[PDB]
Write a protein that binds this DNA or RNA. Structure first.
Length: 1007
RNA sequence: GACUACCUCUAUAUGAAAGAGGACUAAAACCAUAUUUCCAAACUCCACUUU
């Protein structure tokens, strides 16, 4: 009934299999027409739907089995006649059986008034039980008198199971044998031959639109005192209008279409099945607006018709289009899409070296200074013909077609024109790549030297973590699509170990998830050491061993389905076979997660596949760390003798110099742009079939790992970024601007020797430095004050944080202190002291500039991700016309050269070249001028602005669109709240601050 | 319903096309950008925001 598909039938699952011949209801891994007998088993649930179609909201438990046992012979159960059935039977039925119900048999000879049958179920049920004279009910006698009702349900079930079964077999790909698909096929062919497809005013007169919208407004301005049911009785006045003009609704097929779109208009603004939440407007119902919208959302279906079989010509697939073949295109257009937006951000970085505004105008002194930040080496004066032409040949060599991914990462040569090609082997770049590879065992040590680690652990306790046999501190990290991050593993693992022990205990037998207190340096040693033993030593081995991975899944499944009752959530996901690779069982987990994405959101149910992937990886990291002797990490214990014994670590790699161009692209990316690329690459790698071409991807997925070790080296000396103290003091006075620069946080230890700031050089590496000098120079309350350093001495935060943890733990034993009006104010003042101290600490070290830089990149890279779908749709509708160019496309009102200007500067990152032109909120306004192509992509442009800012701790409101001449303008920007101590209280705290939010708005609206 | 989607099929035009389907089409979710929110467990089918 409700779910035909995605439902068990014979302890087997059900899928649909669309095809150009028709539709098919198939089991799971098979290919047979089983739509006849899947639909036959799906029939005890049709009886269960009719019983809930004849019974009411106080779902009574004695009328529930009287009705159900008439329909099912086996289901009938003995009940008493008189005592349990003596109520108001008329007040327990449905709202459809309260009054007499009339119908015609399914296959009646013809419509007539002598065929329609009458039924009063409240009358016909009282007349039988008085004729029932036994102590208990007799099924043979009762069924015989209820014969008038049983034929209603057998008619109801048998006709609905015929409508669903025809809705499936005709649901084919790109149908033209149907009504309203043949009609859109008629309209599409009358535009390529440049004609007019339809006329609104001539079809508005046959529909008699003015007889409607006058009766619709009447039903709106008439009564409707109660907000509930207003929406239901605009449906019935619309069903009344169709009834009087039905004689030509069956005879036109274009008039009929006019009714389907105006029906669909009504249940999106005056909803009936769509979670109301808002009072309707009378503006929508007015005549001349609905006709404008019908013109607007019927052309949407013509443009979607053109692109959807222009896709079937770019692949050579338009006769064998299959449901299975279509999915395969969805996947390889995700790896190819994520790979493009990385090249647009790497190409931006190559712009700022050469010419930020192409080879002729080079600032010569800036180039060498810019080169030393990406690459840790130093270039000569005589190499800028071979370095600036050598990098561009790594990014340059979008056509959405059949890709062959071998000879896509190789690229042996690059050309230099004044044309004379070089290899990358007899070049200066070769020395850089090899130098990086042979310094891996000391880049680990400097990552260990920093963030304590060596100051809290002894060197004998570190020579037995890189010395474990079968683990070699790889640069590879996983061979699986859905693996967690480490902070999801360690934080959620704290939740399973530390648990109340006062329950139906769900023990996982964990021991290493000990602390959570981030305020110490002892814990930040073991957190940083666990982090790198779970990424280099453990993730590669675990993911490729069949026995190690399987032994953790088999503990998890048998921990769940071995306790009493039926409520067991890991019920329908199967156990790992023997001789099965872990990249083949976790491709089963990924596919189940994405087929059940809609069924889990129709009803309010949680994603139970997420908390399965946690517990396997949480338990398996404990079994690793205890089978070896690696359990001393849980006790740091700061040492006294600085031990001068070396930590010798073994490492060997077979990377040849065929990767010496893709490494030059990964050195121009970020640290977040690199991690995301690697996650999409492991999804696309786990669906390919060849034994080669996967070794292409696992050799480039190791180049990314080598790039990550460096990441944020930056500078170390002082006078390599500046020349004098007066140029340092000129630049740094744009953010603090005082006589405060000769102090402790801003000079080294004594005298006048400076210190360089890690969030300020980072802005300079990228091109966002100019923008942030315009932001902080608008006001003067943005810079570091003398009172902000003065607040960092008012008191200590360690004695306040401790107080908060103590007061919170007492609330678990005494929840009644939530209504203690004196206690809840003391807890409020402790939170606001921790909050105000942490904003002043961040402001003093200029950490926020780092936050502003990250926030700006996310907004401009999302906008470059809509301009790549629009570019893919432009070449999908153009190559269809050239197979049958501009004079047709400017008759379809598609891509102009006024919108190609807007689509080009969004994609080419032209916001960052200093001078503004137009703000950020005028780039989201320009994105939905290009994407007015369809509503699916236009409606989502503003939906993704609010999601990005909401992840960074902020809300946003956006004034109504008809008042602002269709532009985006801010109403309210406010810090988002956390709601300490329960869910129905007033004790809360802002996620960021009111001061950070003001800075953010002055960035979004800044011309 | 810009946020607060969309598109294919389906007709005894009505207890209603108020029905089914979408990894098939978009957006999220997942991912190596520090820390305050108690936590863990909670099967399937069928209903359900008016009357």
């Amino acid at each position: 009934t409700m779910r035909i598909t995605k439902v068990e039938v014979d302890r087997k699952k059900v899928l649909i299999s669309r095809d150009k011949n028709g539709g098919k209801l198939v089991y799971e891994n098979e290919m047979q027409d089983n739509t006849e007998q899947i639909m036959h088993h799906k029939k005890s649930s049709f009886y269960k739907s009719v019983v809930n179609k004849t019974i009411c909201r106080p779902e009574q438990k004695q009328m529930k089995k009287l009705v159900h046992g008439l329909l099912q012979e086996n289901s009938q159960e003995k009940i008493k006649v008189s005592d349990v059935t003596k109520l108001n039977i008329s007040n327990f039925l449905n709202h459809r059986f309260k009054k007499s119900l009339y119908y015609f048999p399914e296959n009646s000879p013809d419509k007539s008034e002598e065929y329609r049958i009458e039924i009063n179920l409240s009358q016909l049920l009282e007349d039988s039980l008085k004729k029932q004279q036994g102590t208990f009910i007799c099924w043979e006698s009762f069924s015989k008198d209820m014969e008038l009702y049983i034929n209603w349900a057998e008619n109801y079930i048998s006709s609905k199971t015929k409508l669903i079964k025809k809705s499936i077999r005709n649901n084919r790909i790109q149908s033209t044998e149907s009504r309203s698909g043949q009609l859109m096929d008629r309209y599409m062919k009358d535009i390529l031959n440049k004609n007019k497809p339809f006329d609104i005013q001539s079809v508005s007169e046959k529909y008699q639109l003015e007889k409607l919208t006058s009766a619709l407004k009447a039903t709106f301005k008439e009564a409707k005192k109660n907000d509930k049911e207003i929406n239901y009785k605009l449906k019935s006045t619309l069903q009344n209008h169709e009834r009087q003009i039905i004689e030509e609704l069956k005879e036109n097929s274009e008039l009929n279409q006019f009714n389907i779109e105006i029906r669909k208009h009504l249940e999106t603004y005056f909803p009936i099945k769509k979670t109301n939440r808002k009072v309707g407007d009378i503006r929508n119902l007015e005549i001349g607006e609905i006709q404008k919208i019908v013109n607007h959302r019927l052309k949407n279906k013509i443009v979607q018709r053109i692109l959807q079989e222009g896709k079937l010509a770019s692949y050579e697939i338009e006769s064998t289009v299959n449901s299975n073949s279509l999915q395969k295109i969805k996947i390889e257009e995700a790896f190819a899409l994520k790979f493009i937006n990385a090249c647009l951000f790497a190409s931006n970085n190559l712009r700022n070296m050469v010419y930020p505004v192409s080879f002729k105008e080079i600032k010569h002194k800036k180039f060498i200074r810019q080169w030393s930040q990406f690459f840790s080496q130093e270039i000569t004066v005589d190499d800028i013909e071979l370095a600036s032409w050598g990098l561009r040949g790594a990014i340059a060599p979008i056509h959405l077609k059949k890709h062959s991914w071998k000879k896509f990462f190789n690229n042996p040569t690059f050309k230099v024109k004044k044309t004379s090609e070089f290899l990358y082997k007899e070049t200066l770049f070769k020395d850089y790549f090899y130098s990086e590879l042979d310094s891996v065992p000391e880049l680990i040590i400097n990552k260990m030297e920093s963030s304590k680690i060596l100051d809290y652990y002894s060197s004998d306790q570190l020579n037995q973590v890189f010395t474990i046999p079968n683990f070699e501190l790889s640069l590879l990290t996983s061979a699986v699509p859905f693996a967690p991050s480490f902070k999801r593993v360690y934080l959620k693992g704290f939740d399973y170990q530390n648990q109340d022990e006062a329950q139906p205990d769900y023990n996982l037998k964990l021991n290493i998830y000990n602390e959570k207190a981030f305020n110490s340096e002892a814990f930040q040693a073991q957190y940083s050491l666990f982090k790198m033993v779970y990424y280099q030593v453990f993730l590669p081995q675990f993911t490729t061993n069949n026995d190690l991975f399987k032994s953790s899944v088999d503990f998890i499944l048998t921990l769940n389905k071995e306790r009493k009752g039926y409520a067991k959530a890991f019920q329908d996901i199967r156990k790992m076979n023997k001789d099965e690779k872990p990249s083949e069982y976790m491709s089963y987990i990924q596919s189940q997660l994405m087929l059940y994405q809609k069924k889990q959101e129709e009803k309010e149910k949680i994603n139970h596949f997420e908390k399965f992937i946690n517990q396997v990886f949480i338990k398996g990291f404990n079994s690793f760390i205890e089978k070896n002797r690696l359990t001393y990490i849980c006790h740091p214990t700061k040492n006294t003798v600085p031990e001068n014994d070396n930590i010798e670590i073994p490492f060997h790699t077979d990377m040849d110099d065929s990767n010496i161009a893709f490494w030059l692209m990964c050195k121009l990316l970020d640290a977040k742009q690199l991690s995301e690329l690697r996650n999409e690459m492991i999804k696309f790698s786990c669906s390919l079939q060849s034994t080669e071409e996967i070794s292409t991807f696992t050799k480039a997925r190791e180049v990314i790992g080598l790039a990550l070790l460096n990441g944020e080296k930056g500078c170390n000396d002082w006078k390599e970024l500046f020349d004098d103290k007066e140029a340092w003091k000129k630049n740094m006075s744009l953010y603090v601007s005082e006589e405060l620069l000769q102090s402790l946080p801003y000079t080294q230890e004594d005298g006048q020797t400076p210190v360089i700031n890690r969030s300020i050089d980072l802005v300079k590496k990228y091109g966002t430095e100019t923008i942030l000098e315009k932001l902080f120079s608008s006001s003067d309350d943005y810079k570091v004050s003398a009172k902000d350093i003065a607040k960092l001495h008012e008191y200590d935060v360690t004695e306040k944080i401790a107080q908060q943890e103590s007061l919170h733990k007492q609330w678990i034993e005494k929840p009644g202190l939530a209504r203690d009006s004196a206690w809840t104010k003391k807890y409020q003042n402790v939170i606001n002291d921790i909050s105000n101290y942490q904003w002043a600490k961040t402001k003093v070290e200029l950490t926020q500039v780092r936050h502003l830089h990250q926030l700006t990149i996310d907004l401009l890279s999302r906008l470059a991700g809509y301009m790549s779908i629009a570019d893919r749709d432009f070449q999908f509708s153009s190559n269809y016309i050239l197979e049958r160019l501009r004079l047709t496309l400017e008759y379809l009102e598609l891509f102009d050269n006024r919108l190609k200007e807007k689509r080009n500067n969004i994609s080419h990152f032209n916001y960052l070249n200093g001078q503004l032109g137009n703000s950020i909120l005028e780039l989201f306004d320009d994105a939905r001028d290009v994407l007015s192509y369809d509503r699916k992509l236009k409606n989502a442009v503003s939906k993704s602005l609010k999601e990005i800012l909401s992840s960074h701790g902020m809300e946003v409101t956006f004034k109504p669109l008809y008042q602002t001449n269709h532009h985006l303008k801010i109403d309210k920007l406010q810090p988002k709240k956390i709601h300490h101590l329960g869910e129905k209280s007033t004790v809360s705290s802002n996620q960021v601050s009111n001061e950070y939010c003001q800075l953010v708005r002055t960035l979004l609206t800044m011309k």
